[PDB]
Amino acid sequence: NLLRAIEAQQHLLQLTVWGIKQLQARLLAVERYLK
Amino acid sequence: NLLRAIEAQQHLLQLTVWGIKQLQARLLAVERYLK
């Protein structure tokens, strides 16, 4: 059950990766808009 | 000792989740303001 814990943490990591790429694209769009 | 690493990585995961929610809420407020 160490492995199931690790496996579920990997989906958490994947969700943070997703959130970060979403923010970067949008923040980049904000930075472009203002230049 | 693998368990404690996992416990400690979970504490890091909640910190990164916290930071992401913080950034989402503030980027949204920005995008909303500029419109």
């Binding site: 969700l15 979403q22 | 368990l3 996992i6 979970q10 909640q14 989740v17």
Partner: peptide, 24 residues
């Protein structure tokens, strides 16, 4: 995938790990 889904899933998976942590 949307932020509503993302958020739901954070909770789901957070709960799981914590359960499973207590158990191993």
């Amino acid at each position: 995938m949307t932020w509503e889904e993302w958020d739901l899933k954070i909770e789901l998976y957070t709960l799981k790990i914590e359960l499973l942590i207590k158990k191993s």
